[PDB]
Design a protein around this motif. Structure first.
Motif, PDB file in Angstrom:
ATOM      1  N   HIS A  92       0.872  -1.169   0.000  1.00 60.35           N
ATOM      2  CA  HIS A  92       0.000   0.000   0.000  1.00 60.35           C
ATOM      3  C   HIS A  92       0.909   1.219   0.000  1.00 60.35           C
ATOM      4  CE1 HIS A  92       1.053  -0.734   4.141  1.00 60.35           C
ATOM      5  NE2 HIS A  92       1.098   0.584   4.182  1.00 60.35           N
ATOM      6  N   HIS A  94       1.306   5.584   1.325  1.00 62.56           N
ATOM      7  CA  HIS A  94       0.915   6.781   2.057  1.00 62.56           C
ATOM      8  C   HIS A  94       1.265   7.978   1.183  1.00 62.56           C
ATOM      9  CE1 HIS A  94       0.683   4.392   5.811  1.00 62.56           C
ATOM     10  NE2 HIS A  94       1.617   3.711   5.176  1.00 62.56           N
ATOM     11  N   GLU A 104       6.087   8.967   5.110  1.00 62.88           N
ATOM     12  CA  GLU A 104       6.120   8.766   6.550  1.00 62.88           C
ATOM     13  C   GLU A 104       7.551   8.929   7.059  1.00 62.88           C
ATOM     14  OE1 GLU A 104       3.622   5.068   7.275  1.00 62.88           O
ATOM     15  OE2 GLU A 104       2.401   6.760   7.932  1.00 62.88           O
ATOM     16  N   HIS A 117       4.896   0.850   0.900  1.00 61.22           N
ATOM     17  CA  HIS A 117       5.232  -0.157   1.894  1.00 61.22           C
ATOM     18  C   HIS A 117       4.862  -1.527   1.362  1.00 61.22           C
ATOM     19  CE1 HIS A 117       4.982   3.067   5.273  1.00 61.22           C
ATOM     20  NE2 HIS A 117       6.121   3.086   4.620  1.00 61.22           N
ATOM     21  N   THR A 196       2.808   1.901  11.494  1.00 62.04           N
ATOM     22  CA  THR A 196       2.626   3.346  11.541  1.00 62.04           C
ATOM     23  C   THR A 196       1.163   3.736  11.654  1.00 62.04           C
ATOM     24  OG1 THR A 196       2.569   3.550   9.165  1.00 62.04           O
ATOM     25  CG2 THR A 196       4.729   3.716  10.234  1.00 62.04           C
TER      26      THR A 196
END
Ligand SMILES: CC(C)Cc1ccc([C@@H](C)C(=O)O)cc1
Ligand SMILES: [Zn+2]
Length: 258
Positions: A92, A94, A104, A117, A196
């Motif tokens: 996935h 971010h 992140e 990730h 996270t």
């Protein structure tokens, strides 16, 4: 559980339901490139994705996950800082509302436009749910995204996002090759950390690649048209689904390269 990324349910609130949010090995972190030390004990990193079997893509209300068949050792991560064999279960991203934020991890406080990730679990624990209860349960490959040229290997993901706009939607996503998302170089930084997002468990060996991949403005704009909300609810664009950098505390970031 009602956590998210807004003012009222975002990262500054998570500790009230998940006190480990203030723990000793939380992620992400800032990578200070002048303080990270080359470690010649790190073995070569082994990304073996040629037999990967992707299955489905899911909007879970926080990101979208591309899920893999992890009932056998088909796509595995080995080597580097790792002992044993870690199976790919999903990837996935971010990302940000603007190109100047979204990752992140940060590198000398630089934020990239997004971060990929690739999540793997340690086969010695038998299943993913058991692995996340162990300090060495997960190995996550983190790859920064910058905006420039298009990434051809990402386009098949971008073009299905229309069909999973809202929370709880999924679509078949077979025969996707995650090797098309990697940079040329596998040089990396590594440190012990955490999930996270809630439940923020301290179960992750982080392996963050130094070389970002380039995606186009049109590709990341399609990320930003997704929704956090479900169908038939007020529209909340899925942007800024990143946790900021957490204190490094009693940890050293090791580099695989000079
Ligand atoms: C229910 C939980 C266990 C799902 C989950 C998987 C992976 C992550 C981290 C490692 C990440 O990649 O953001 C965070 C949450
Ligand atoms: Zn993630």
């Amino acid at each position: 559980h009602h956590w998210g990324y807004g003012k009222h349910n975002g990262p500054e609130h998570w500790h009230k339901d998940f006190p480990i949010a203030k723990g000793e090995r939380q992620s992400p972190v800032d990578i200070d490139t002048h303080t990270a030390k080359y470690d010649p004990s790190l073995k070569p990193l082994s990304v073996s994705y040629d037999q990967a079997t992707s299955l489905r893509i899911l909007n879970n209300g926080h990101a979208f996950n591309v899920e893999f068949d992890d009932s056998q050792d088909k796509a595995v991560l080995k080597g580097g800082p790792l002992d044993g064999t870690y199976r790919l279960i999903q990837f996935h991203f971010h990302w940000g509302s603007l190109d100047g934020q979204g990752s992140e991890h940060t590198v000398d406080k630089k934020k990239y436009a997004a971060e990929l990730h690739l999540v793997h679990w340690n086969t010695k624990y038998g299943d993913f749910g058991k692995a996340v209860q162990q300090p060495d349960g997960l190995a996550v490959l983190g790859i920064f995204l910058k905006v420039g040229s298009a990434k051809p290997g990402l386009q098949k993901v971008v073009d299905v996002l229309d069909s999973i706009k809202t929370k709880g939607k999924s679509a078949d996503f077979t025969n996707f090759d995650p090797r098309g998302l990697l940079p040329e170089s596998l040089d990396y930084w590594t440190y012990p950390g955490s999930l996270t997002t809630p439940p923020l468990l301290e179960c992750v060996t982080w392996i963050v690649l130094k070389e970002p991949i380039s995606v186009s403005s049109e590709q990341v704009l399609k990320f930003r048209k997704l929704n956090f909300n479900g169908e038939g609810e007020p529209e909340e664009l899925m942007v800024d689904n990143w946790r900021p950098a957490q204190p490094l505390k009693n940890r050293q970031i090791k580099a695989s390269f000079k």
